[PDB]
């Protein structure tokens, strides 16, 4: 056997939206392709934000 610990093997993070909203899933498909096929890190940030929950996507005021 090997001497390692397995309690941190699985990283806990959103790999997809928990939402079943089909328009959200469509633009998740779009930005998944964009993140994969471009070198832009903006696309990666936008995709990981699309995965997020509502409390992790707080509203932004006009001011």
């Amino acid at each position: 056997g090997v001497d390692i610990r397995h309690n941190k093997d699985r990283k806990v993070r959103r790999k997809e939206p928990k939402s079943q909203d089909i328009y959200l899933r469509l633009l998740v498909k779009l930005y998944r392709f964009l993140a994969r096929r471009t070198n832009s890190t903006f696309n990666q940030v936008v995709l990981k934000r699309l995965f997020m929950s509502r409390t992790n996507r707080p509203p932004l005021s006009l001011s």
Partner: protein, 125 residues
């Protein structure tokens, strides 16, 4: 839109058969009869289907016209090919490839036409 309608019917459809770890889809213009975005015979602006002829000989190639998407009565043009197998396959190949009419279904339509013609020739003893 095809992607929007696919997100609606990919798992909830009256043509869906989920059984024996397999999935099939039975809408009229589906070559290979599989539940898939590419082969779905309802959600696309242009689809092609191959069916056995009304009598016991030939095939019917049905393609979806461009204009009347919301008018199902006139949306499909059906033609009957009742020639020998090689000429039938050539006709279907020319419908799909020469027209640039959905060329990702060319071999699926050719293979389905071959299956239909082979089923139409008489059974052996």
């Amino acid at each position: 839109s095809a992607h929007l309608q696919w997100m609606v019917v990919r798992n909830c459809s009256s043509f869906l058969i989920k059984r024996n770890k397999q999935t099939y889809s039975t809408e009229p213009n589906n070559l290979k009869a599989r539940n898939s975005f590419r082969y779905n015979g309802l959600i696309h602006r242009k689809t092609v289907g191959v069916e056995p002829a009304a009598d016991g000989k030939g095939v019917v190639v049905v393609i979806k016209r461009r204009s009347g998407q919301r008018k199902p009565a006139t949306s499909y043009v059906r033609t009957t090919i009742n020639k020998n197998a090689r000429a039938t396959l050539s006709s279907i190949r020319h419908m799909i490839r020469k027209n640039k009419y959905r060329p990702d279904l060319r071999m699926a339509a050719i293979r389905r036409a071959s299956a239909i013609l082979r089923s139409q020739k008489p059974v052996m003893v």
